[PDB]
Design a protein around this ligand. Sequence first.
Ligand code: CLA
Ligand code: CLA
Ligand code: CLA
Ligand code: CLA
Ligand code: CLA
Ligand SMILES: CC(=O)O[C@H]1CC(C)(C)C(=C=C/C(C)=C/C=C/C(C)=C/C=C/C=C(C)/C=C/C=C(\C)C(=O)C[C@@]23O[C@]2(C)C[C@@H](O)CC3(C)C)[C@](C)(O)C1
Ligand SMILES: CC(=O)O[C@H]1CC(C)(C)C(=C=C/C(C)=C/C=C/C(C)=C/C=C/C=C(C)/C=C/C=C(\C)C(=O)C[C@@]23O[C@]2(C)C[C@@H](O)CC3(C)C)[C@](C)(O)C1
Ligand code: KC1
Ligand SMILES: CC1=C(/C=C/C(C)=C/C=C/C(C)=C/C=C/C=C(C)/C=C/C=C(C)/C=C/C2=C(C)CCCC2(C)C)C(C)(C)CCC1
Lengths: 161, 214, 169, 172, 144
Amino acid sequence: WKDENIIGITAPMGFFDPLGLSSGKSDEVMNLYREAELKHGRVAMAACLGWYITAAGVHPAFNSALSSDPLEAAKQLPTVGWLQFVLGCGAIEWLAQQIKARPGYQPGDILGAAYWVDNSDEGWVDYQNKEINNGRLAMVAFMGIFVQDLYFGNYGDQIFR
Amino acid sequence: AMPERLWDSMVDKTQRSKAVPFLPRAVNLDGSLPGDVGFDPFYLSSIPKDFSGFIQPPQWEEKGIPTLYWMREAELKHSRVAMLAWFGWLATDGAFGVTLRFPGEIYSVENIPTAYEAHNALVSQGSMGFLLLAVGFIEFCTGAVLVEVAKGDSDREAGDFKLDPLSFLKGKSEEEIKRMKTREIANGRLAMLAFGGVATQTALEGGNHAFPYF
Amino acid sequence: MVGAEGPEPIPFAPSRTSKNFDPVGFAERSPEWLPWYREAELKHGRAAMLATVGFVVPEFVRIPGEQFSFEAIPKVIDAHDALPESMIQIFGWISFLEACTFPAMAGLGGKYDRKPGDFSFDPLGLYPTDPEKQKKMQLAELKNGRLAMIAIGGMVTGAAVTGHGFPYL
Amino acid sequence: AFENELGVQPPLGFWDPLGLLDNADQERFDRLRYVEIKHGRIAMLAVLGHITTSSGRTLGGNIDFSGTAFSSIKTGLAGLSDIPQAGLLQIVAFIGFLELFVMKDAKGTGEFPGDFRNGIDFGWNNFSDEEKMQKRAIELNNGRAAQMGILGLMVHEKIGGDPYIINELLGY
Amino acid sequence: ANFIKPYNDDPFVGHLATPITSSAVTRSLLKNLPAYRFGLTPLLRGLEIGLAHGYFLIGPFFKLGPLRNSEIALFAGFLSTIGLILILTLGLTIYGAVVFKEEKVMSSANVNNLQTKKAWDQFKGGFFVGACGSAGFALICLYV
Ligand code: CLA
Ligand code: CLA
Ligand code: CLA
Ligand code: CLA
Ligand code: CLA
Ligand SMILES: CC(=O)O[C@H]1CC(C)(C)C(=C=C/C(C)=C/C=C/C(C)=C/C=C/C=C(C)/C=C/C=C(\C)C(=O)C[C@@]23O[C@]2(C)C[C@@H](O)CC3(C)C)[C@](C)(O)C1
Ligand SMILES: CC(=O)O[C@H]1CC(C)(C)C(=C=C/C(C)=C/C=C/C(C)=C/C=C/C=C(C)/C=C/C=C(\C)C(=O)C[C@@]23O[C@]2(C)C[C@@H](O)CC3(C)C)[C@](C)(O)C1
Ligand code: KC1
Ligand SMILES: CC1=C(/C=C/C(C)=C/C=C/C(C)=C/C=C/C=C(C)/C=C/C=C(C)/C=C/C2=C(C)CCCC2(C)C)C(C)(C)CCC1
């Protein structure tokens, strides 16, 4: 699986896998790992962007809150405003299970782009690396800004601002 | 990571540098230049960029300077300026016995007590602005050569100008020239760090402005 | 494990031995990281040996200066936070030595000719002539470093618990 | 090797992330099975002795001669100091005497790890071989799920007020 | 890379296969809608469709109605959803009465086919049950 799924292998650490979490595993558990990693990166990339915009000031619908750990988790109402969102992500997950039980499917290809590209166009391979490398930088960065607000009071930039 | 790494075309994994024996020698260093012990722990000589682009842009024509050559040319100019600047900074402070100052009231002790306030004081007056123009003329008349050597049209050594008015080296064996050249470099190196010392201490919270600056 | 020395007859206190000590199998899983692992194990051991004696000598000696003194600081565990002008400075010069190490790390492995840990650092001349004594020589550095890694983790954690003198008892 | 056993089922399949079974023989695994079951058999009873106390159904009367009551003792870790000392000494000596003698395979004729039946069949051959493997997996999965339940109940009662983190939402 | 090719490898056919037409999202979504799902009686096809339409046709009648500000704002509009469904069903009856042809041979091995006269009638009656029932369902859900 390591030699057929070249996406994710870059110059800083060509196939960085210390601790042997990947050593001698079936495809089905391996394909789970890649589909988990891509899902974590996508959510973290969208969380980072959604956290910076609410932090920077522009929080548009009802004008409620600037710090966005208050806005969501103490303040936004549990009964409906969180129920629906999780329900709406649940229908996307259900839809993606129908996506996964088809022939010729990649570990993380919801759009079904493998119908137009066979992964041997480097530009495709190269662009995919851009998504996943960024996704990786976003997972650590969301954890960095979440601990920063869970513990301290500062929720914005501590490095440049 | 599956291209051919850039660490191989610029690191030479066969020999080792005289300075820092645990690192391999950079490819452009030799024993050829004066004052050389193979010292380049950051592998700067090995950067494959044309640093003559700063003077003339690379889009003007085909052309390329060796990176090592441009560095030596810099290091000589950094040496020469620092040998004079350290010497000139102390001499106007009276570190050699006599407080050496230009004739005239404007450059005397009463208007400028020590060299530390000579840059800001002379900048307002204009004598500083005049020296900027005078250096500017020389730099422009001497930095065009870098272009010639980068076009392969010259066989001039780095930092070499026919400036030997007292004929120190006319007819000296290459062993004699190389040793003399090493003196320009070793004394220049010590004076680059001497000026960095003097300019730094003299600007912290304490620190005097006497001949000794500690 | 073969060639690279280190596993040798020292009985562990549970009924096992260190004749080949790799419980979770880092040798067979990712053996390309083996030169990085030895190089790590060394640098952790070298700094722990120096920091062990670095706790011994500042009990009775105290180099001349007002900034650190017994009257200035009685508890040598507090020299970290109360001399920060010397702290950044030691940190600054280590960063000059660690920075010239990068290109040795960048070709750590089969590309550069050197074995991990092996600076060309022998001014006095004490590394011996033949393998029989040389492998014994490299082995004595490993155990002394490993004994010193576990040492200062017991020394520093002891001093926060007991708050006492040098053998802590 | 050990990928088609009782304990392997959907959704996760054969779930060995850390890799303990990459260098396991028969003997290495039979120790892992025998006690993960035992960890589960504790935790499933740790759900039963626990729910009925927080629901309030307590034993009638006092506890001893000297007059401690069952209703006064709270639920969770804080109730361990309300029980008397010699009362805790009878419980620990019980569960000591349990595993030393009677939770034991002394005949050597156990069919599997976790079998304490000791050759006295209770109607286990009444089960067909598929029904045998069904009931052995239900105990295990309820064993595995109760471990994370009690680890829930111990950590949430220490952090928060009640252990029932899932009954905390939508009104206690 | 190219994300646009002729549909079904037929360059002269007048269609383009784009990510809006044939991608994994739009393939699995359209294949599970009741007008295209495998394994549905034409009654069931019409039932579901009707169940999902009568429920939201409610909204604009109850809110922006001529009697929206009265104590009988819910009644006014529910009645007018039924009148909308009667017009839509009437368009379904007439469409199938003219598009499909009656069958001579009693021969019928596919009783499941939707594009037939017999099945369209079942499909039309399922739409009317599901749309009046979903109109009544949010009559209960809004009366709160
Ligand atoms: C960080 C320090 C460090 C590092 C990098 C190494 C590296 C190495 N050791 Mg080593 N060792 C150390 C400290 C270290 N040692 C200490 C303190 C002891 C004394 C107990 C030993 C005793 C020891 C023996 C007896 C042997 C080795 C061997 C080896 C080599 C092969 C094993 C391997 O790759 O695993 C190292 C890979 C790592 C990723 C390092 C482990 C770091 C873990 C993940 C930290 C996790 C926490 C840890 C359990 C500490 C507990 C404290 C607390 C958190 C509970 C390798 C070069 C073998 C050898 O020489 O092979 C030729 C061998 O026989 N080691
Ligand atoms: C959910 C998070 C997650 C997941 C599931 C993966 C999974 C994977 N990564 Mg990966 N990675 C991640 C996060 C993740 N990574 C992050 C944040 C980084 C940046 C350092 C990377 C950097 C990275 C590189 C450079 C490479 C991979 C590769 C791989 C694949 C092969 C290695 C493997 O099997 O690990 C399995 C991973 C898991 C089973 C989950 C990790 C378990 C964690 C929880 C252990 C402890 C977490 C950590 C120590 C917490 C402390 C830090 C902080 C966040 C608290 C595999 C699909 C390789 C690849 O692409 O091959 C094609 C590869 O070259 N990853
Ligand atoms: C983890 C992702 C995430 C989560 C949980 C939230 C959660 C929240 N955001 Mg937020 N947001 C996000 C990402 C997220 N945001 C991103 C990426 C942006 C940049 C566009 C924003 C921009 C933003 C603003 C300006 C505001 C919030 C607000 C809110 C709150 C109300 C929900 C809302 O109105 O969102 C609005 C934004 C969205 C609903 C878009 C986010 C979802 C993306 C990923 C769209 C993807 C949908 C799907 C992939 C495509 C299907 C449909 C499509 C094909 C047509 C809620 C606390 C308000 C708030 O509470 O302020 C304090 C508020 O003022 N959001
Ligand atoms: C790096 C060299 C350097 C620099 C930048 C300065 C700069 C300064 N000196 Mg100074 N000085 C130096 C070396 C230097 N000195 C040396 C080496 C000596 C001793 C021999 C002195 C002796 C000295 C005295 C005695 C005094 C100064 C003073 C001053 C200040 C005003 C001078 C002025 O405006 O220019 C006016 C001078 C000129 C315009 C002279 C012409 C300079 C030419 C154009 C330079 C180009 C030739 C150069 C040698 C390179 C040759 C070409 C090259 C390719 C080889 C100014 C801060 C005055 C002051 O304020 O003291 C506090 C003052 O009284 N200097
Ligand atoms: C892991 C097991 C466990 C533990 C440690 C506790 C701990 C506690 N319980 Mg509790 N309890 C549990 C299970 C547990 N409970 C079960 C299984 C039930 C219902 C039968 C209850 C019902 C219960 C009541 C009704 C009361 C307590 C009370 C108490 C407290 C005082 C001790 C006492 O009187 O025990 C009482 C123990 C029991 C009534 C039953 C113990 C059953 C054990 C777990 C069976 C396991 C051994 C068994 C012989 C195995 C059979 C194998 C077979 C094949 C031979 C204490 C906090 C009292 C209190 O003060 O409340 C706070 C009280 O009034 N418990
Ligand atoms: C007038 C007069 O004299 O009356 C007075 C007398 C007196 C004495 C004062 C009285 C009293 C109080 C009494 C009698 C109180 C009794 C209290 C009692 C009897 C309390 C049992 C707890 C059992 C537990 C916790 C079991 C845990 C069981 C555990 C933790 C297990 O999981 C066992 C496990 O085994 C499995 C299943 C399988 C094994 O593989 C693994 C293990 C071993 C771990 C009264 C009532 O007031 C009346
Ligand atoms: C005749 C005789 O004398 O003896 C016979 C009697 C009899 C009956 C035949 C016997 C038997 C077999 C028995 C007793 C078998 C028992 C099996 C049993 C009791 C199995 C429990 C599983 C519980 C699980 C998995 C719970 C997970 C619970 C989890 C993961 C939770 O979520 C906890 C949660 O709490 C949080 C953290 C928060 C709240 O938001 C939500 C909830 C509450 C949901 C014996 C042994 O043969 C002895
Ligand atoms: C600390 C200073 C340090 C710098 C500053 C630096 C910078 C670059 N590294 Mg490098 N590096 C390490 C140290 C440093 N690297 C270490 C310790 C490792 C082992 C973990 C390491 C590993 C690799 C691999 C595997 C590759 C690699 C490359 C380049 C590259 C050119 C990019 C370009 O211009 O295309 C640049 C600028 C790639 C190459 O040569 O080809 C594409 C390549 O595969 N590196
Ligand atoms: C906006 C949007 C969207 C969309 C969505 C939608 C479009 C939805 C819809 C929904 C709907 C539209 C729903 C519906 C529902 C319905 C219902 C819920 C019904 C019910 C019914 C019932 C239950 C029944 C009834 C009845 C009958 C039939 C008979 C008689 C009796 C009764 C009355 C009971 C998306 C995702 C794209 C994205 C984002 C945005």
